[PDB]
Ligand binder design. Structure first.
Ligand SMILES: *SCC1=CC(C)(C)N(O)C1(C)C
Ligand SMILES: *SCC1=CC(C)(C)N(O)C1(C)C
Ligand SMILES: *SCC1=CC(C)(C)N(O)C1(C)C
Lengths: 134, 134, 134
């Protein structure tokens, strides 16, 4: 298996920040993909499936979630996938994004939310970001 | 790269209609896939990953989103993937659908919502529809 | 086409239970994947894309949805993907999960909700669970 692949997950001990980690069980960062400055770096040109989920939580705002592309050539962030959700017992709100994109070598991808202080990663599998070359 | 692929996005200037476009940056329509009468036409038999997202917006209904298959042989629409969501400051509501399906040559796929007048495509990456042969 | 693949759907006649079926049109269970005791059994090691959607309905709770891995070696359930949603006319709430994972031969996957009595499968395409080897 030599396809570029990543499936990174939120650091559960970061406070007020969405920090992606690969060195967890059931996470991946293989075959050229790099995690640099919290972004995923594409090893080769091609079509990639790109996806991410966040979970928000509260008790008693507009919340969005975006995956953006930084082109190696044009050093400016373009949204590839984006969603917005409007929300004392607790409430939860997931958002999922995923699509296929042609990327070039060295592009960086970030999966970002506007209010990291609303994230819930109390349990595994709740907040994640991945790519696979197809 | 010779895999059939499409990633089409809502026309932001259509009013009250979900019109899919490929001639945008970060959109795709390659290797046999066609966009005909707002539907995606499958070039060859095989397994395809199929997906789509819509974003709804309001201020101050049942809203659904479906991907359907028209078989070349049986000219009738079958839902492959479907979701329903129940919703003066603004509110937003995304819906995501995605799955793998065996399709035959010439099948048409549509990604449809019941109330296009509730869609929000004010910004890129909010409303999209894609397939990839796997 | 020899890739392991499954796309299973909720049994619409089960009452208060999420029972996955493959013997429906537009469903799949091919090339080694097995459905045993309501779980999907992986035929070979490799990277798999794994996904599932549920739809909840009510009229007039915390609702979650998880895909878990049972390792053949370690017979304990780990959540791979999980989401929680907080909700007389009817209301509906979808949840979608999907990610790429390295699995080993004989692993079992389950897609589970905590309140099957809230599920809505009145129509096709609403509740589904699939994998594809990549
Ligand atoms: S999602 C929060 C923020 C406000 C809004 C206009 C809804 N979003 O697009 C951004 C990210 C700018
Ligand atoms: S989603 C809007 C409309 C009504 C309802 C029964 C909820 N949907 O299934 C359709 C598309 C028919
Ligand atoms: S989702 C229902 C149930 C309660 C809660 C803590 C929110 N979930 O994690 C479980 C599955 C335990």
């Amino acid at each position: 298996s030599d396809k570029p692949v990543a499936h990174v997950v939120a650091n559960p001990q970061a406070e007020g920040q969405l920090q992606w980690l690969n060195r967890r069980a059931n996470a991946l960062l293989a075959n050229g993909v790099e995690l640099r400055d919290n972004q995923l770096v594409v090893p080769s040109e091609g079509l990639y499936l790109i996806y991410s989920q966040v979970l928000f939580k509260g008790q008693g705002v507009l919340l969005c979630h975006t995956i953006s592309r930084i082109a190696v050539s044009y050093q400016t962030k373009v949204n590839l996938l984006s969603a917005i959700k409007s929300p004392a017992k607790p409430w939860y709100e997931p958002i999922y994004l995923g699509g296929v994109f042609q990327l070039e070598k060295g592009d960086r991808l970030s999966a970002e939310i506007n209010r990291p202080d609303y994230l819930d990663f109390a349990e595994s599998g709740q907040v994640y970001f991945g790519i696979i070359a197809l």
